Amino acid sequence: SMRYTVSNLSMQTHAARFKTFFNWPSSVLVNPEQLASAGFYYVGNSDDVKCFCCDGGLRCWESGDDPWVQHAKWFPRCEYLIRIKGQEFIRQVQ
Amino acid sequence: SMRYTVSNLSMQTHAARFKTFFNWPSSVLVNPEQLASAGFYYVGNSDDVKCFCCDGGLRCWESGDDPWVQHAKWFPRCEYLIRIKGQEFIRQVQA
Ligand SMILES: [Zn+2]
Numbered sequence A: 001s002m003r004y005t006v007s008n009l010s011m012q013t014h015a016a017r018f019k020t021f022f023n024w025p026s027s028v029l030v031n032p033e034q035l036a037s038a039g040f041y042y043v044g045n046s047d048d049v050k051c052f053c054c055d056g057g058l059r060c061w062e063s064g065d066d067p068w069v070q071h072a073k074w075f076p077r078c079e080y081l082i083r084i085k086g087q088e089f090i091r092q093v094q
Numbered sequence B: 001s002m003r004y005t006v007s008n009l010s011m012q013t014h015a016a017r018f019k020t021f022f023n024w025p026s027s028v029l030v031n032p033e034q035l036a037s038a039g040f041y042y043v044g045n046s047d048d049v050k051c052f053c054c055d056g057g058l059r060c061w062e063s064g065d066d067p068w069v070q071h072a073k074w075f076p077r078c079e080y081l082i083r084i085k086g087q088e089f090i091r092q093v094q095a
């Protein structure tokens, strides 16, 4: 067996993730560009997103929700979140 | 936002983990019995499994893979692994 850190290899790029928000509702008010930058792609319902790396799923996004802060709130061990924001950032949010 | 994906905390029992392997691919030649015993549950994607305790992810399972040995190979600090098999076993595998 091999260790893996990335659940969805097909969603590793920003463009691949951002494309999934083509049919995302304008009533949500969290920006799909920022969601995509934070590792998330749209998977169903009104606003379900998953992280391509940790495979964590978040929904019921509130206006003013910060995609990176939510990622660190719920999924602090995510290796993508660590690579971009660093463990200091995560420790701060936790 | 709210999490909706499954938590490692729901996978603490052998039975709950075993249950996840209902659709485990026939082509993957490692038995769900030994996987569940070793702390792993199936995440529904391909042959990806995760440990309920250390959250380690393993894929690409090969014929004859011993899940306990693989757990010790890749995640030697896992507290579940330590509790069941011991550090003597883990050290043995690591060298
Ligand atoms: Zn993540």
Ligand SMILES: [Zn+2]
Residues within 6 Å of the ligand: B039, B051, B052, B053, B054, B055, B056, B071, B075, B078, B079, B080, B081
């Ligand atoms: Zn483990």
